[PDB]
């Protein structure tokens, strides 16, 4: 996260770290949506142009974390994966359309002050909150700039949703209805972006109707980090919600 700030303790209790077993390192962000299901970006698990194709046994999920690097004894919970599910129409060949994946944990995780699931949006919440100018929040342990390097603790930044024409006009990439973009415009003064390592993490909004946090997006892609005239792109979670429910209902 670029131009973010240190998270408060328990500020994002759904935040998940996707962690490689060997070498032991951060791979991606992710989010907890129930006691046994974690949501992330497909490209965190599968991206053939970079020879990336992780299997269940390659990875761990670390939940309840604040510090990036330390083993937070008595606080974090580390879980093994039972099964990865990648959207069958995830477009890694072109534009990362439908950049979404679910991970089923081998055993359910115990909720705590530091571990709690985020809500997925219903049609009506999505319709009301996914509007240009409305701010959501992105969190992760990714890079602090495009080229300090890495954060000591979880970072947070609040970013406005950007109008579709402005998103489209910022890039040569083909934008789809399964994506939205967020970030400040060059004139707006304030800055901030996700960066490498934040991928797969949540873009959340707090509903003013019921005071609950909803995950509206997944950190998907960008060109650099926090560049003027560019915006971060997020997977549009509600648009892929039918696939999400199908996987959870079936498996």
């Amino acid at each position: 996260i670029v131009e973010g700030s240190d998270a408060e303790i328990g500020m994002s209790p759904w935040q998940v770290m996707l962690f490689r077993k060997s070498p032991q390192e951060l791979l991606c962000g992710a989010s907890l949506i129930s006691d046994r299901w974690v949501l992330t970006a497909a490209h965190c698990l599968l991206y053939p142009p970079w020879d990336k194709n992780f299997t269940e046994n390659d990875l761990l999920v670390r939940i309840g974390k604040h510090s990036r690097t330390r083993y937070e004894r008595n606080i974090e919970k580390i879980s093994m994966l039972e099964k990865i599910y990648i959207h069958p129409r995830y477009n890694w060949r072109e534009n990362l359309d439908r950049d979404i994946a679910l991970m089923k944990l081998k055993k359910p995780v115990a909720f705590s002050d530091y571990i709690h699931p985020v809500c997925l949006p219903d049609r009506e919440t999505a319709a009301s909150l996914l509007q240009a100018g409305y701010k959501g929040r992105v969190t992760g342990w990714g890079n602090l700039k495009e080229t300090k390097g890495q954060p000591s603790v979880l970072q947070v930044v609040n970013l406005p949703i950007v109008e579709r024409p402005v998103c489209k006009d910022s890039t040569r990439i083909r934008i789809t209805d399964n994506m939205f973009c967020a970030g400040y415009k060059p004139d707006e003064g304030k800055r901030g972006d996700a960066c490498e390592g934040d991928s797969g993490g949540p873009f959340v909004m707090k509903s003013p109707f019921n005071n609950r946090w909803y995950q509206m997006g997944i950190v998907s892609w960008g060109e650099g980090c926090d560049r003027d005239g560019k915006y971060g792109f997020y997977t549009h979670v509600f648009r892929l919600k039918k696939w999400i429910q199908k996987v959870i209902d079936q498996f």
Partner: peptide, 11 residues
């Protein structure tokens, strides 16, 4: 790398 080793039980 610069991560603290996690308990072997999880590996």
């Amino acid at each position: 790398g610069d991560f603290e080793e996690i308990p072997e039980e999880y590996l």
